[PDB]
């Protein structure tokens, strides 16, 4: 049975911050992926 | 008259080593080539805007 080999879901992580003089909250931008291909493994973050 | 061009960002680890070579950790021995290329690509991307 012949099968395709597509590579892993990857991209770039861009952190958006207002500066440390204002606050410490950050927003990440996973470039080039869908809302389902982002890691939804936040409940299992200790597995890496 | 042209105004802007295509903004391109290059992942050096997947290009040089690959998405299947976990034993190719020797790219860290070469220093900071990926950082000094990503800085130029980021400058090109913020220049085209």
- CA-wise closest residue to A16 among A32, A30, A29: A29
Chain A residues with CB-CB distance to B14 below 8 A: 10
Euclidean distance between CA atoms A41 and A47, whole angstroms: 9
- Cβ atoms of B12 and B31 closer than 8 Å: no
- Cβ atoms of A31 and B7 closer than 8 Å: no
Q: Which helix (H) or strand (E) holds B18?
A: none
How was this entry determined? cryo-EM
3-state SS assignment for residue A29: strand
Resolution, angstroms, 1 dp: 2.8
Euclidean distance between CA atoms B15 and A46, whole angstroms: 29
DSSP label at residue A21: T
Nearest C-alpha of chain A: how many angstroms from B49? 17
Cα–Cα distances in angstroms (integers) from residue B7 to residues A14, A32, A37, A41, B4, in the given order: 15, 14, 23, 31, 9
Q: Does B11 contact A at CB distance below 8 Å?
A: yes
């Amino acid at each position: 049975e012949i099968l395709d080999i597509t590579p892993c879901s990857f991209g770039g992580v861009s952190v958006i911050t207002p500066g440390t003089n204002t606050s410490n909250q950050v927003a990440v931008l996973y470039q080039g992926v869908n809302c389902t291909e982002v890691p939804v493994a936040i409940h299992a973050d200790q597995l890496t | 008259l042209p105004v802007s061009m295509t903004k391109t960002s290059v992942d050096c680890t997947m290009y040089i080593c690959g998405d299947s070579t976990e034993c190719s950790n020797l790219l860290l021995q070469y220093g900071s080539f990926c950082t000094q290329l990503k800085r130029a690509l980021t400058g090109i991307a913020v220049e085209q805007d």
